Amino acid sequence: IFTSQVSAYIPVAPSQGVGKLPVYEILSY
Amino acid sequence: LNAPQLVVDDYEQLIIDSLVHTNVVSNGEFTDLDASGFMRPFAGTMAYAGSELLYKANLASIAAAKSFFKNVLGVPEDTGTKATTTLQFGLSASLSTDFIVPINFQVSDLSGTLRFYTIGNLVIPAGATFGTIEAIAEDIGEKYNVSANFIDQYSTPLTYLQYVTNIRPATNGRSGETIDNLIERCAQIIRIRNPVSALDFEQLAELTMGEGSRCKAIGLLGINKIVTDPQPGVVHLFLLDVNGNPADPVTISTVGATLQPRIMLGTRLLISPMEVLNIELELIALSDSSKTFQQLADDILEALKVFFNPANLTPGEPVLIEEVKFAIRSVGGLSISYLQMNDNAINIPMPNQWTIPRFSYIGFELTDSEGTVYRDNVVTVTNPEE
C-alpha cells in the first residue's frame, strides 16, 4: 500500500530648480 | 420601469377580492366577506402564494427588455464616479535627497469627514520645495465636490512635509445615475450610427472627452460665429471640459482627432471652447421650522448645484426663473417669497447659442414664524472667469 498525507490550508483572500549650490568656474575650451 | 401591469398583485387586495368573488360564485351561499374575519386564515394563506407568484409573473416584459438591453448591446451597469482633485505638497526645507510621498496618502478637510487618497507615488526631486499629484475621493457622491484649498488636513506625518492642499476644486462627484439616464445611455448606442444631427454630434463628443463634460453642435456656423452668415458644409462644436471649464486646446485637438474619421467627406469641422454665464441668486424665503436654517441652506445649495449641473443644462437655452424657484422649493420645509437672478426677477437669456449657465453666488434671507432672520452668503466658484 502507498499512503498519502496532505497538509493544506486556505490563505486569506484580498519646483523649477534647486536653491543654492557652490560657486563654479566655467572655462571655454 | 413604466411597463403595464398584467394582473393585480397585492396581499390585502387579493384577500378582499377572493372573499367577494367566493361570495359571488355561490348565489350568496357564502356570506363571510369580512376581510379580517374567520376566513382570514384560508384567504390569507392562498393570497400569500398568489402574491408571491403574481409578483414574479408581472416582471416578464421588464425582464425581456432588460435582457435585450444587456445581452445584444452589453451596457455597463454604472454605479457612480469618484471626485478627483490635484494636491500640492510643500516641504519644510530644501533637502539634499529626493522626497517620496507614498501612494494612497490620505488627506482630509477641516471637518475630517471627506477623505482623498493620492493616485500614485510622488517624487519631489532634491532641492525642490513643492510637488503636485492627483488624488481621488474615498467614495462616490456629489458631497466630495469641494472648493479649492478645502482639503489640507493629513494625519500621517512625513519628515519635512510642511503642507498639503488641493489647488483644484474636486469635480465629477456622482452618486450614480437614474433609470432615465441609463435609458438615454442605452438609446444613444442604438442611434449614433453616422453622426449627422446636432444631438448625434454632441453625444459623440461628450464621449472620448470624459464624463462630466458638455458639447454644443451648431450647423452652418462659420469662423466668425455669426448666425446670419450660414456656411453650408460647416459644423461647429463648442466644448466644456470634464472640469466644467471651457475646453483646453489639447482636449479640442483630441476631440477633433476622434471625430475626423466620422464626419462626411468634404465637410468642415470647427471646434472651439464653450462660454459660461455666471448666475447670482438672491433668495428671500419663509421657513416652516421643520428644518434648521443651516440644514435648509445646505439642502437648497445642494439642490441648486444639482440644477446647474452642465449635464442637466442645455447650452444656449434661457434660464427660467419659475424653474429655479421650483427646484429650490422641491427641497421642502420652506416657502419662497422672492428670488433674484443677476439683479432681476426676469428670465435670463443666454447671450448666444453656445453659452452655458454656471451659478456662482447665492444669498439666503430665511425668516421663520418666530421672526428670526437668518442671513447667509455662499460663493460656489473660485473666480468669475473660471
Binding site: 490563505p11 483572500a13 484580498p14 | 425582464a63 425581456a64 432588460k66 435582457s67 444587456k70 445581452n71 445584444v72 448591446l73 452589453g74 448606442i189 449614433i192 459623440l204 464621449l207 472620448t208 469662423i223 461647429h236 486646446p249 479640442i252 485637438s253 483630441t254 477633433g256 482627432a257 476622434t258 471625430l259 475626423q260 474619421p261 466620422r262 464626419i263 462626411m264 467627406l265 468634404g266 465637410t267 468642415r268 469641422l269 470647427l270 471646434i271 472651439s272
Partner: protein
C-alpha cells in the same frame, strides 16, 4: 479659438471611442437554458393516455416539482397538448449530475470552482439551500433594514 478639422480616413482616436455595442451572453432570461443535457443521459419515452409531466417527474426524478427540468429538456410549453405517441426525453436522476459543468474562474481574491448548468437543474440541486454554505445565507441578511422612499 477655433481649430479646423477635415475628414480623415482612419485615425487611432477612432480606436479610442470604438465599440459601443458588445454582444454578451451573460445571465439573462434568454440565457437560462444555454447549457443542455447530453443525449446519452436521457430516456426516450412515448406519450400515452393518462400521462402528465407530474407523473414523469415523480416516477423518474422522484420529485413532483422536477417537471420544469423535463419540459426544459424538451422545449415544450407544458400547457400545450402533447399528442398521443409523441416522444419525450426524460432526464435520469443519477445522470443529471454530470450535466453540470465545472469551471475554474479567476478573481482578484482567488480562483474559484464554479458550477454552471441550465437554471432548472441548478434550482433542483440547490433545493433546500443544502449546497450553499451558511455564510452566504448570513450575508444575504447583513442588509436587513431596507430603506424605502416615503410617498
Amino acid at each position: 479659438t477655433t481649430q479646423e478639422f477635415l475628414s480623415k480616413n482612419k485615425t487611432i482616436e477612432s480606436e479610442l471611442l470604438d465599440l459601443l455595442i458588445k454582444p454578451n451572453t451573460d445571465d439573462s432570461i434568454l440565457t437560462r437554458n444555454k447549457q443542455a443535457i447530453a443525449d446519452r443521459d436521457l430516456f426516450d419515452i412515448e406519450w400515452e393516455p393518462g400521462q402528465s409531466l407530474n407523473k414523469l417527474a415523480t416516477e423518474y426524478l422522484g420529485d413532483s416539482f422536477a417537471w420544469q427540468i423535463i419540459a426544459d429538456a424538451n422545449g415544450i410549453d407544458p400547457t400545450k397538448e402533447i399528442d398521443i405517441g409523441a416522444g419525450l426525453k426524460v432526464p435520469d436522476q443519477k445522470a443529471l449530475e454530470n450535466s453540470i459543468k465545472k469551471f475554474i474562474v479567476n478573481s482578484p481574491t482567488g480562483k474559484q470552482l464554479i458550477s454552471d448548468a441550465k437554471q432548472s437543474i441548478l434550482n433542483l440541486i440547490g433545493v433546500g439551500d443544502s449546497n450553499t454554505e451558511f455564510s452566504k445565507t448570513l450575508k444575504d441578511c447583513i442588509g436587513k433594514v431596507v430603506n424605502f422612499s416615503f410617498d
